């Protein structure tokens, strides 16, 4: 998985979901008066409305990532082997990992409010069902000022980090992931100087040689570096159409192509989908692996005061434009 | 530029066109009875029909790449500084670089016929006009057996190479480009073995670590290695829709994103378009940088006995699908 | 800087010193009854003898690294910008960075005893003098069982790490440095399998292609990975001569060559020297940049009950052997 | 194997010999009136004196590398699978690959003289003895002007190349080996500039980060790049002691450590010795894997008009200096 906030003019937040199998995701809008039930907290009977990609299990939205009507966004990305969910604490809001996105996006409008709410939270070891055991996740949270932060629940407790580069992938823990970027200071959009020796003729035989050491791999660290390079060198435009086009080139640059990340016999982790929300306008965009026409769901064209889930199918089939 | 042949069941040939500035291009079917004129050879009054993308002129089809009705495909890719075109030779067929595709694709059906014609050819230093100086190219040729061939006109003469990997980018010369692949034997879709030492605990901390050393750069050798890894590990499917989807994932895996390959002040080489032809069926497909919905032009739906160029606009503007 | 413990049979501990300027340093044995004086603690009037390379100033051994007579070793490696030394603390033993090696090596014989002393230490922001401001260092400590730990004094306090690979270089902090090794699991002494695709003919055109992605750089992470690869694939022998021979190949594999690491105009960081001590025997070995004949100083041939520093020159000029004479 | 000419003031030519088995080589001075016998040419009864490392096979010097009294040096380096030796030719001096060094260094004093002799040569497929096949080699040749050239005998003929970097290792052919240097222009002794993006704070956390991408491997291409970086950034001094010290630091920077290049079960290729000769002065220097004190043999202190080989044992055992 890869998640970014991209702030050329308006602010766009979203992620690639990298898994080996698709099973029942939809675009889900949760309106303000849908009651969020919590295992160990009183229900949120009214809350901010939100939109994202989710499973719908027994009428409950298990969000992979979402954005609320105040321009606050949040995404849960795989964090295998690192994620720890804790015992219940008598002095904290005990919130399950699968309840984390509704808890936060339903109650908070800014990063500062997120931090305040997190000062009272305990991400607790609670499973949705015996069938659906909890996934191992860490979270990227960003708001429409362009500020972002990272939440990791490690063995020695929960850690919260300001995110100066506004990107997140998977393992390792954010301090190591962020520091690894320092090793790529010389990766450049421009041709290199001959620093090797002026007594040797270095021929600039290919445009693009500046990025010769850009990681191309499917792994977590390679995608973090690659998405950071793409994000901070992408062009800035004035229109919505241009900036969302650029946004999807950023995420598609770290797409996991089928066959390249093999996790088992004929089993391949790949980018199921790419989404992005205009945090300033509440507009949800997505592409899928097989359908890279941009699909648009406008949260503001729904009745956000209603009390039941609003669902749209993810258009995940190849759609061709036949010019005859 | 990157060009491949991809042979899952049917055979698909095409390329990314990477340039820092466009002047327009278009899809062009040249029918059988469009007379091909040649500066130094008699005209081909009748020939095979072909389809590809050319410059936005209707004087003459100046193809970037094309595929004829017999399943033979050919693409010219930037070869900066290496490409040498020769003085006219009395005992050869003197053919301009911009006449190469019509000359070959107009008369040849197989790689074997291509080689016979190439043995008597001389790629002459002729310009389409005094203003339109010939660009520096080398060529990938492939037919529907999956066999392919590289043509390079260097300063010491024309060299013709069998291509065992069916890929081509830009510099250097093909023996160096092909040999460089030997350095990436251990790049893997599966998790790496701990070869370092069984006394060191190596944590397989991220899926995709097998490809940690896959090159991600925008440069010529990086894209050659990366597209070969993508092509030979791409899944094999049974439907046309699935295999052409896969084909565009291979080409998009070596797309040059705007901003990442700087050739001058605010001037960036980027992937203008990606195209692919089903050599077996005569069906032409393309995406462009800003419109990655796949566009289809079926050559067999046209009057191939016509005498006039048949043209279609390249739809290069972002197409959104609004769902609510 | 690069420091290792190498444990083929006996145990060998030491380091490359990577700096841009030398002058002053000697092989220095501090005997049992040389009185170690401390700015904020009572003097150690008698203590374990030790041997190492030191800058002697005002009759005080400013050790770069040393090993004591009980087979405990300790080295201070550059930690630029990372090292933080603290205000004096009540309820702690306040010890200056330049007194750290005498404090530990004078009093401890084992890692377990080192850990006891560290639980009550505080590395204080104290300078040798106005002209000698304290260096930014972190420390590798190893004993003759082959166990080692790392001490790093960061902005948010002192951290002590068990060291499973027995190697240290410079920045970054040890958890990041140790975790970076995970990126090199596929580096191999053996020819690589063709994982790329069995549809592509990968020619095995050179021996050694298994190590094609081994880092060769002069930088701290590169050297950490390269020294670990060298150490864990080095052969093990049953002889002192062979095992110390191997030891210096490990250290020399990560030598910084003059001209390859420029830290300012006409100023280059390079490996001044490599040393190694046999912890089980008390034998100090070293080479220098211009003299890679192994020089030997046996601490046990000196009077370890004396009270004065005992010094030997670092033989740092090239000594050619004319076979033709 | 790695071979260089290093030209700080005087000129130093030599090599690392990288093999898995030591045989029993020694330092051999061949005086002017030792008769060189050839299988298919008249004997060379008087010739230039030379010094180098040789096997000894009943009175015949089989040099790995040598340098003659006129300052011409030559080294045979493994070229596995690539070396082709030819059928005898009726119009050429047919010289065995193991006769090549005596043939050249016996009669030539300069690179230009070498090039004239090579115009009449045919490196023929002659083995030294029934159960000792010829080894597969290519050669680096250099003289006291600093100039060097490469001789490679490939399937399609002998190829001679001027060597602009004065370096050679093993496979592949020299054109590909040399061109690969272009991929390392940015490898630097100096700290890198932040070209990734100035919106990203890149910490220059370690001295030497400029060489972060210097290859460290044991393989042929890695050592070629690494010895070149070491050679052209090595300091230049006024005296012999200083320059020969620098010279061995260059060769030792590409030493293959035991255990790092496994060629078979419990069998490793390693640097058996490093040697260099002062071309201007005829002084021979060497280290061995286990003895890094520089050993010196002055060819000119011997009787160069003699008729018998003059042999010295290689001091290959560790010799310690006990200071107390």
Author numbering:
A (entry chain D), B (entry chain A), D (entry chain B): 2 to 325
C (entry chain C): 2 to 326
Can you list sentences taken from the study reporting this PDB entry?
We found that Lactobacillaceae BSHs display a clear bias for either glycine or taurine-conjugated BAs.
To examine the molecular foundations of BSH substrate specificity, we determined the crystal structures of six of the Lactobacillaceae BSHs examined above: four glycine-preferring (LgasBSHb, LaciBSHa, LingBSH, LreuBSH) and two taurine-preferring (LgasBSHa, LjohBSHc) BSHs. We examined the sequences of these loops and found that taurine-preferring enzymes exclusively contained G-V/T-G (‘G-X-G’) motifs, while glycine-preferring enzymes solely contained S-R-G/S (‘S-R-X’) motifs. The glycine-preferring enzyme clade containing LaciBSHa, LcriBSHa and LcriBSHb exhibits the highest activity.
